[PDB]
């Protein structure tokens, strides 16, 4: 029923509450251990998508059993992310790499989610320029640049989320932390 | 030159002068003495171009009394892209600094298409400051020389001994090559830029580095501004 | 006026090449190397230059409007891979990344196939404009092509297996004499670029 | 340049009976001819130890890591130090009841030098 | 102290200068990061 981190020494970092607000809604077996892992950051791993791809290694053989936790700050303190199962890497364009058990959710001081519907499976996707969530008509309802500079979100099938950034259709970035557990 | 300095030191405006071109004037120099029967020097040149090119450059500088001011920006055209011409080597003991134009660059469609390592102000130390300008001039600009000239041999090693033996260092640098010489140096032939404006762009290519790792920018410094 | 200054020996020491260069507008250097090899067309492409380049957009957007972009594209390609080739020699091509080999081998099929062209045979004789804007679409797709499939994982010694065919294509392109449909010929270009895409498509799966 | 698809040993009896109870050395049927030799200490001859070795090396080429006891090795040190191609792969180990002999080994005896 | 072209050949020579001290200078490298890993496989083969 607590989390731990393992950050150093930077000036942001994430919530205790926050954790364990959002620890509420994902599978079981994953709740019970909780012991979360700064994976990769903005402020002590540079800005480069590169770094970030190498820095998340698919490392899954300890644990295939693995959630993967991206959130990002917007523009104006807007926060919010994304639930993977998946390590995030450039693939062949075959398919979408997903399990059908992902979410999205619009975090504050206000939690929100959008549990992933059967409707389809579209934008669990992941290339060397852009990594995006849940799509289909309309742009991608996650969307972060090869520079992490602007980002997209709008509504999609494979969600029915609804607008995550204060500044809908597109926004900048100021922050980002990925988690593993 | 003549009416520039009249405006300047008897109107006291600040003035700037520009030539875009000193080889021509050193054939029409040459032509002159052969009419007269003054043997050829090195290269063929007259010796004493030193005397007249100097007196052609140094009415420039701030007067004591009076509030104008002068600059002077001519433009050499190197024969065969020697410095060991004396037209060069001339202009370079007389004026200060200089600015080159790489060929390279131009090829890959660079526009203005500079190279930086060359280059050089020795008064730059004068120039920037507080009031003058922002307070972190001086230190991103040594910062991006060093990373600038670390990126072009990482990208040299890169054939050698592949991609994953370089260090994480090696790697960086490589990406923020590409990307300042992509963005920063690229302007458009209309595109008009403060000196605020490419300050914050060269802060925003800066910020791929972490933090840390900018050991020649000051602490203070990399505290103010790395944020967001 | 066309002037055809005369080679003093040394490549420019010359003072009468430096008085040309110092007024005429477009120089066509020339190039030792490429003349030992037969390659008859022995324009150097790196110090030959024009400034004509700026003016003439205005006339290529009223009807073509991709040669700048693509010709720039074209020989930011050819000095990536004349200055790799400088240093490859020294160690040799063994420590190379997919992108490298790309490079290097899109720069030799453009250098013998593109740039070399005999003023003997009739299908070589004249090359009109359209002709060499979709041939030259044809390459840089082509390459584009190959740096975005190897860019999202897979290894270019596999794919160069089935690419092969459409290598082979891409080269015997200029094969194509014109003066046959003027239109005709664009047509077949845009059938064999389709084609170049649905074989990558294929392939890369 | 996989010719060399077997391994040979030169070892003692217990350590030649384990290891084809495991089953590496085959009788190739091929050459009705058996790469692993069960050396005898003792009765078996230098000349023999040789042979068998310029065998696997020059004639039988279908051996890649030619095992040998450090001190059944130690008895053709000359042998030993004297062929040093790296394409097929040399091992030596300590024999029965016998311990780790570190100057029993040719390649860790150039490693302690030039280190 | 060689065979003596004197045909206005600087830019050759030059040119072989700049090629000398580039594959010096890879070379170096080059050999710094083979002996670095040729340490570690020393080690662990040993142990």
Avoid at chain 2, 162 to 189: C, N, P, R, Y
Avoid at chain 3, 157 to 167: E, I, N, P, R, Y
Avoid at chain 4, 47 to 57: A, R, S
Avoid at chain 4, 70 to 78: K, L, P, T
Wanted: charged share 25%.
């Amino acid at each position: 029923r607590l989390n731990g981190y393992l950050p150093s020494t930077k000036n942001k970092l994430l919530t205790p509450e926050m954790c364990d607000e959002i620890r509420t809604l994902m599978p079981t077996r994953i709740q019970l251990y909780t012991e979360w892992n700064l994976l990769y950051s903005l402020e002590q791993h540079g800005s480069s998508l590169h770094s970030l791809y190498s820095n998340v290694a698919p490392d899954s053989k300890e644990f295939r059993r693995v959630g993967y936790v991206l959130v990002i700050k917007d523009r104006k303190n807007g926060i919010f992310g994304a639930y993977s199962n998946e390590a995030f890497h450039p693939n062949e364009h075959r398919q979408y790499t997903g399990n059908g058990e992902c979410f999205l959710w619009k975090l504050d001081k206000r939690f929100s989610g959008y549990p992933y519907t059967g409707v389809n499976e579209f934008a669990i996707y992941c290339t060397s320029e852009f990594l995006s969530m849940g799509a289909g008509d309309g742009h991608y309802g996650l969307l972060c640049d090869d520079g992490l500079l602007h980002g997209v979100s709008n509504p999609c099938q494979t969600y029915g989320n609804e607008v995550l950034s204060k500044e809908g259709k597109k926004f900048s970035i100021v922050a980002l932390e990925v988690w593993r557990v | 030159l003549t009416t520039a300095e009249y405006l300047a030191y008897q109107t006291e405006r600040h003035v700037l002068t520009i030539l875009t071109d000193m080889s021509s004037y050193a054939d029409a120099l040459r032509e002159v003495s052969a009419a007269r029967e003054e043997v050829p020097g090195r290269r063929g040149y007259p010796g004493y171009m030193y005397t007249d090119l100097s007196t052609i450059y140094e009415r420039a500088g701030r007067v004591e009394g009076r509030n104008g001011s002068i600059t002077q920006i001519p433009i050499l055209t190197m024969p065969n892209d020697d410095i060991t011409h004396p037209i060069p080597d001339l202009t370079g003991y007389i004026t200060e600094g200089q600015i080159f134009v790489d060929r390279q660059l131009h090829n890959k469609g660079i526009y203005p298409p500079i190279n930086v390592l060359p280059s050089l102000s020795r008064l730059m130390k004068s120039a920037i400051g507080e009031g003058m300008t922002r307070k972190d001039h001086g230190d991103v600009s040594n910062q991006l020389y060093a990373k600038y000239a670390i990126g072009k041999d990482a990208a040299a090693m890169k054939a050698v001994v592949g991609e994953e033996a370089l260090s994480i260092e090696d790697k960086l640098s490589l990406e923020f090559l590409e990307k300042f010489e992509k963005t920063f140096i690229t302007q458009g032939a209309y595109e008009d830029r403060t000196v605020f404006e490419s300050l914050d762009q060269a802060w925003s290519l800066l910020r791929i580095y972490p933090k840390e790792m900018l050991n020649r920018i000051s602490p203070k410094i990399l505290d103010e501004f790395y944020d967001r | 006026i066309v002037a055809a200054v005369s080679p003093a020996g040394g490549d420019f020491s010359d003072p009468v090449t430096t008085a040309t260069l110092g007024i005429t507008q477009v120089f066509w250097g020339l190039d030792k190397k490429l003349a030992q090899r037969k390659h008859f067309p022995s324009i150097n492409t790196s110090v030959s230059y024009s400034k004509y380049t700026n003016v003439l957009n205005k006339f290529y957007d009223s009807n073509y409007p991709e040669f700048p972009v693509l010709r720039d594209r074209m020989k930011e390609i050819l000095s990536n891979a004349e200055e790799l080739e400088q240093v490859v020699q020294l160690v040799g091509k063994s420590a190379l990344s997919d992108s490298d080999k790309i490079t290097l081998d899109v720069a030799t099929l453009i250098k013998e196939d593109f740039l070399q062209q005999n003023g003997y045979s009739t299908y070589d004789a004249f090359c009109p404009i359209w002709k060499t804007f979709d041939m030259m679409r044809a390459f840089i797709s082509y390459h584009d092509e190959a740096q975005k499939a190897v860019a999202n994982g897979a290894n270019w010694s596999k794919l160069a297996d089935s690419t092969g065919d459409v290598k082979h294509a891409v080269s015997s392109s200029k094969f194509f004499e014109p003066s046959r449909g003027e239109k005709e010929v664009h047509g077949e270009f845009e059938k064999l670029l389709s084609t170049m895409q649905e074989r990558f498509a294929e392939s890369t799966d | 340049a996989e010719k060399r698809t077997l391994i040979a040993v030169i070892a003692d009896e217990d350590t030649t009976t384990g290891l084809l109870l495991a089953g590496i050395g085959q009788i190739t049927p091929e050459t009705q001819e058996k790469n692993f030799f069960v050396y005898q200490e003792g009765k078996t001859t230098k000349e023999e130890i040789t042979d068998k070795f310029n065998h696997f090396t020059e004639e039988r080429d279908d051996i890649a890591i030619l095992l040998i006891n450090q001190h059944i090795a130690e008895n053709i040190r000359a042998r030993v130090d004297s062929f040093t191609n790296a394409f097929p792969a040399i091992l030596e180990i300590p024999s029965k009841d016998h311990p780790y002999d570190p100057e029993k080994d040719s390649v860790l005896k150039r490693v302690r030098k030039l280190f | 102290e060689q065979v003596f072209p004197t045909r206005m050949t600087l830019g050759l020579m030059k040119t072989k200068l700049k090629g000398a001290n580039q594959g010096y200078s890879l070379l170096k490298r080059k050999s710094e990061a083979l002996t670095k890993r040729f340490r570690d496989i020393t080690k662990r083969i040993d142990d």
